[PDB]
């Protein structure tokens, strides 16, 4: 402001509308999952005319024009292509599908529609409108203070929500099933593994499948395996990780460490470092969750990231840059450690004692 | 549908980066709620975080959830981050950017208010129901949410007209810088008219701006039914379908927008005859958005198109280059020139 240029002062202007109007970007993705578009397409085998497409969805003739305004946006941000002969004015645009659109055909393996759904529920999304009273309250998550409730009980009272939360619990087994697949230099040489905080098993499966030699002790509280059946390779072990983990050549936390302060996650690192390094044997710590780095990633990427740390901070969780890794694994007593790629917000990290 | 994983991937990241889009808004929102440019700005220096929390006095256990939205807002151009005095030793600064500039209120160019308003909650959310929305003849996006247009709802309750009132007031600032930076358009003008002016407060800041002007405000009978104007500044009623007052130059800003192209076309050769009477030769004004791919930089396409939606909820219709070239063609004028105006309108000239 002070004694700007004007076209500095109104460039800042259009930053701060694009950021005020942000949540646009999100309810026009959700009016596309609610309008079923990215199946009409697929199921149209080509490329689909405004025209037909707006026929098939029924609109009518006064919002014609708005389906466009809509479509163009969602193009524009890598929904859809839109296909056009240029120097043909009297023929329609066309529709085709992205990848990232094909990721919301309802029906499909990795289908991310269910997840979106969810997180634009009208009551969990509205929450964030109230982020000061929930900074001024000790310990309660922006859920407990803005509904009265944690999404536990937000689940238990609202059916459609749950319907969507166990398809995306289901889709995103898929993908992780397919981020397996390439870190078979990671898994390849392991004769067994212990999943910490393994939950039902579902990620000890998918393991297992995958690498049809290793063992899996789908390792968790004892009420979170209480009956549960392991089979082949595939067995439960109730316990706490914070007293003793069950020894392995390897060790995997995915997803467990962002829900632990600094101190919580160093004690756990250092009962599964123990758990790999008895019998006189010396394996490794596996560790698959988000890693935060400026300098490494594309600005994009660590955008999200940053997007990421904020809303699992709703929840009293934390996402970690690097340096805060090397903290922990230095604090824990480890040697050394390596960084890769697992899916596209998550990395897998090999820990050495 | 076989994609390679890293392709898959990048998608799943786009996905989630528009799916919590809307958490771009709301910490935003918050940063405004707490004061945090104000706080900046009064402090006259880039301010450490632990100082930030102890003004603002945050909860212990909600200091790293500040930290982490201040960074996010950093990184979406809000602040600026400064790095501590010592290696290893983490204590970082805010300093303000020409973004959050704008959000330090009592200052002449605030647009928090702008910000308070589209993010009213009850607002907002019409933005849920698009769906029902696209299937509903000619209603608007708030009447089909809300039950009724935007001005019955501010009728039936008042207390958001202070909100209202004072957003409008933000961009009326906008208008006026704006108008300021353009010298080269009113050169020469001894008087102009503004088509569809309404009460007159764009009149006014001509007219304030070039004293040497004379404005008048032409609308509707009953929208300056009542109006009184300056020395400079007249008002006249009629129907601009009809009839345009003659002067050296016609206004249109934010009017062009809200008609087909076939009324505009209709309003176009009016505007034309206003100016190209008495053997003279003016020129039309249009101050709207000017959509071009092709010229604009990446992000403020992003926003004109991101605009294109929201304007249309209340069934306006924005403009690409192309588009406006076209209805200026059938209007019968020879040729126009489009200028920087504000952050999202532009202002053509337009000549017959
Ligand atoms: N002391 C403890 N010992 C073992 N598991 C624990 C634990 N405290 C919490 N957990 C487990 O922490 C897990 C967090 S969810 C972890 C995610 C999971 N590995 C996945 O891939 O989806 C839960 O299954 C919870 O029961
Ligand atoms: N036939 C007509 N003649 C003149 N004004 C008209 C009109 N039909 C609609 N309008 C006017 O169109 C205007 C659209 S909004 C005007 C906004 C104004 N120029 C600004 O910059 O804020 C309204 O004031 C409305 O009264
Ligand atoms: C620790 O794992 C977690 C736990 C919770 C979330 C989470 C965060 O923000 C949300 C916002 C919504 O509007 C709706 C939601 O449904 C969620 C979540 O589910 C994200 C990661
Ligand atoms: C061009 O004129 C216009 C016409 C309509 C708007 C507009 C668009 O989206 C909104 C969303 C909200 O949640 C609240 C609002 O209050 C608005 C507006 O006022 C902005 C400028
Ligand atoms: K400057
Ligand atoms: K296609
Ligand atoms: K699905
Ligand atoms: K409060
Ligand atoms: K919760
Ligand atoms: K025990
Ligand atoms: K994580
Ligand atoms: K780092
Ligand atoms: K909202
Ligand atoms: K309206
Ligand atoms: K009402
Ligand atoms: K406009
Ligand atoms: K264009």
Redesign the interface.
């Given at each position: 402001?002070?004694n700007?240029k004007?076209?500095?002062?109104?460039?800042?202007?259009?930053?701060?509308?694009?950021?005020?109007?942000?949540?646009?970007?999100?309810?026009?993705?959700?009016?596309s999952i609610?309008?079923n578009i990215p199946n009409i397409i697929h199921n149209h085998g080509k490329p689909i005319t405004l025209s037909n497409l707006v026929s098939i969805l029924q609109?009518?003739?006064?919002?014609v024009?708005?389906?466009q305004?809509?479509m163009?946006?969602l193009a524009?941000?890598?929904?859809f292509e839109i296909i056009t002969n240029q120097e043909l004015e009297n023929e329609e645009e066309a529709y085709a599908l992205?990848?990232?659109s094909?990721?919301?055909?309802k029906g499909?393996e990795?289908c991310?529609a269910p997840?979106?759904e969810c997180?634009?529920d009208?009551t969990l999304?509205?929450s964030?409108?109230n982020?000061?009273k929930?900074?001024?309250?000790?310990?309660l998550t922006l859920f407990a203070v803005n509904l009265g409730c944690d999404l536990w009980e937000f689940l238990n009272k609202n059916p459609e929500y749950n319907t969507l939360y166990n398809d995306a619990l289901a889709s995103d087994s898929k993908?992780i099933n397919?981020?397996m697949?390439?870190c078979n230099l990671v898994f390849e040489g392991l004769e067994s593994i212990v999943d910490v905080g393994g939950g039902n098993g579902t990620t000890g499966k998918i393991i297992c499948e995958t690498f049809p030699k290793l063992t899996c002790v789908v390792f968790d509280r004892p009420k979170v395996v209480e009956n549960l059946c392991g089979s082949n390779n595939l067995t439960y072990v109730g316990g706490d990780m914070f007293i003793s983990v069950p020894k392995a050549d390897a060790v995997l936390l995915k997803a467990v460490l962002h829900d632990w302060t600094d101190k919580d996650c160093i004690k756990i690192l250092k009962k599964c470092k123990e758990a790999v390094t008895s019998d006189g044997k010396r394996g490794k710590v596996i560790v698959i969750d988000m890693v935060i780095n400026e300098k490494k990633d594309e600005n994009?990427?660590?955008?999200?990231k940053?997007?990421?740390?904020?809303?699992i901070?709703?929840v009293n969780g934390?996402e970690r840059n690097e340096e805060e890794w090397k903290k922990l694994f230095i604090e824990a007593g480890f040697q050394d450690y390596k960084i890769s790629?697992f899916?596209?917000?998550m990395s897998l990290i090999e820990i050495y004692p």
């Open positions: 402001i002070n700007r004007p076209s500095e002062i109104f460039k800042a202007q259009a930053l701060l509308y694009k950021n005020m109007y942000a949540f646009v970007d999100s309810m026009s993705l959700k009016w609610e309008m609109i009518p003739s006064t919002k024009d708005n389906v305004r809509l163009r946006y524009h941000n890598g929904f992205t990848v990232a094909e990721l919301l055909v499909t990795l991310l997840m979106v997180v634009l009208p999304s509205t964030f409108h982020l000061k929930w900074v001024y309250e000790e310990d993908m397919l981020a697949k390439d994009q990427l660590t955008q999200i940053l997007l990421m740390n904020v809303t901070s709703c934390k790629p899916t596209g917000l």
